[PDB]
Symmetry: C2
Subunit: 153 residues, 2 copies
């Protein structure tokens, strides 16, 4: 019942996490990082688009969960972040996924239990809820957190 | 001879312009506005993606020309502009277009003859070089300007 893709866009790294809702909770399906540090800006964007599509086609999530951007650090970061976010969103929508947006506070409330949880609490609760031994990279962990936020709504 | 697509992205309005490289200069093919005002963001980004792809399938440009963002007006502005910009660029590349980026000053040098031309001179030289009778909407003529910049160069 519902496989969910969470995306954590970034200027240089876009994290992704796929989880499967179970009656018991959520099972880990996949996670990782799409790295876009090198090359022409347009090649970086198209890798994000193509990689998100291929994650979707491989694992069959029907729901995209993303995090509302609140405060970017500056206008340059916001622009690069936005370009990667847009490229990831239209890739999800080309595959026909629904799209839900949650603030950072909603994500932390659903995963940790309080909107002011720090990064360590989030990463630990992501590994607790998904029964992971291996500490995932922070972008993949955030993306998993965002996916879990959408689960069982 | 090349058919060239120029794109002027925007959260609310994305201008497009298509020109054809002739040996005598450049011929007008199409231009207009992609309006994404009302609706959730992801539906707005998907309109941009699908509309840009539709322009490309209709008029057959094989090259994308886009303008570099140097200074966004602010970080709220930059975020929304980057999202539209990423949606438009990955649409172009899914269709297999090459991509060329020029600075605002290169665009004005190629079209008006000098890098500091104002919006008035640019719109008139767009109409002069393409023998247009009607003033295009501003986003359309910027898009045409950006397309003209790539021609022959």
């Amino acid at each position: 019942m519902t496989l969910i893709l969470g995306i954590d866009p970034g200027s240089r790294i876009t994290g992704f996490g796929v989880v499967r809702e179970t009656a018991r909770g959520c099972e880990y399906v996949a996670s990782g990082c799409i790295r876009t540090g090198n090359g022409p800006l347009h090649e970086r964007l198209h890798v994000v688009f193509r990689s998100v599509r291929e994650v979707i086609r491989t694992h069959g999530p029907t729901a995209l969960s993303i995090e509302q951007v609140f405060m970017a650090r500056n206008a340059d970061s916001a622009l690069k972040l936005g370009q990667a976010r847009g490229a990831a969103i239209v890739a999800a929508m080309e595959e026909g996924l629904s799209v839900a947006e949650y603030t950072a506070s909603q994500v932390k409330q659903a995963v940790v239990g309080t909107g002011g949880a720090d990064k360590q609490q989030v990463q630990m609760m992501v590994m607790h809820l998904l029964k992971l031994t291996q500490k995932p990279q922070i972008d993949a962990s955030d993306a998993l957190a965002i996916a879990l936020c959408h689960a069982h709504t």
